Amino acid sequence: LNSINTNSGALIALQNLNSTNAELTQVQQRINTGKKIGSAKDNGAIWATAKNQ
Amino acid sequence: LNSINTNSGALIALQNLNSTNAELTQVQQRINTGKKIGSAKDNGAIWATAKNQ
DSSP states (O other), X not given: OOOSSOXXXXXXXXXXXXXXXXXXXXXXXXXXXXXSSOSTTTOHXXXXXXXXX | OOOSSOOHHHXXXXXXXXXXXXXXXXXXXXXXXXXXXXXXXXXXXXXXXXXXX
């Protein structure tokens, strides 16, 4: 409380903002590639069955 | 009592003034560093724990 060296609220706010930027990056990928699973990182099993099909 | 060669009241007054000056110096150090434990002299166990942390 009332510290000058530490600001935990800014840390939690930056964590929530980084989560929002991660969701926005996922939506940007969904928009530009047109696929909900555009790579093995999205879902390896469905992407594997898709490459085989 | 009624001595000219000594003044005990000035001695106790100097002791109280030195205590007040030490408290003001501690408050100045806390205003400076921003830490209530800025060094090992303040509290060595908690200080070493914070250093490892």
